[PDB]
Amino acid sequence: ERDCRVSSFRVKENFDKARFAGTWYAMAKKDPEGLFLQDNIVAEFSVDENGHMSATAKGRVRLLNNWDVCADMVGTFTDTEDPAKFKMKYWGVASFLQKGNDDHWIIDTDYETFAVQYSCRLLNLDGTCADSYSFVFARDPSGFSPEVQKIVRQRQEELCLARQYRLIPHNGYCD
């Protein structure tokens, strides 16, 4: 009975790019297939005068070969018919880092305390997601209230990703 079709998923009402800007610490994540950011993940969102959203992000990634690096990533966002759904083109400062073009959906946020992001990289034939990732972001890296945790858990259920997230440390690795 829970609808896990990606096209069914609610996203943030009247999403406000400018209010979303600034520093977001990734507290928890659900991983996609393949190489991905591991931890010490901090994103910096910005919006220019014409409404164009972009971000930088830092995080540790371990290459296929056990080589740990601090990835310095860049993303530029293209707006769509839904103000909370973007296409994110991304690349690294280092040429060997992954480049791509991912959906970037703001599932929920209160702008001042938390955000839940989501990306489906591949649909199954039934419209559910075959390869997703999701970040839970915080403005404050010390933690969420129990009240905010409750809401985040709900959103995670709504994305059919409950119990699939891991907590992410911050330990200064990338500076």
Residues making up the binding site for substrate: 98
Nearest to 106 by CA among 12, 4, 7, 6: 12
Bridge-based pairing state of the strands 53-62 and 22-30? unpaired
Does 130 engage in binding with ligand RTL (CB under 6 A)? Answer: no
CA atoms within 13 A on the CB side of 168: 27
The window from 71-79, 106-114, 146-154, 160-168 that contacts ligand RTL (CB under 6 A) reads 71-79
Q: Toward ligand RTL, which CB reaches closer, 1 or 65?
A: 65
Buried b (16+ CB within 10 A) or exposed e, 28-62: bbbbbeeebbbbbbbbebebeeeeebbbebbbbbe
Q: How far is the CB of 17 from ligand RTL (least distance, A)?
A: 13
Tokens of 97: 């880092």
Per-residue DSSP letter, 66: S
Q: Which of 61, 129, 159, 161 binds ligand RTL (CB under 6 A)?
A: 61
The window from 10-18, 54-62, 108-116, 162-170 that contacts ligand RTL (CB under 6 A) reads 54-62
Strand partners, 117: 106
Q: How far is the CB of 121 from ligand RTL (least distance, A)?
A: 10
Nearest to 27 by CA among 169, 148, 146: 169
Residue with smallest beta-carbon separation from ligand RTL: 75
Does 97 engage in binding with ligand RTL (CB under 6 A)? Answer: yes
Does 28 engage in binding with ligand RTL (CB under 6 A)? Answer: no
Q: How far is the CB of 27 from ligand RTL (least distance, A)?
A: 12
Query: What does the binding site for ligand RTL look like in residue numbers (CB under 6 A)?
Result: 35-37, 43, 55, 57, 61, 71, 73, 75, 90, 97-98
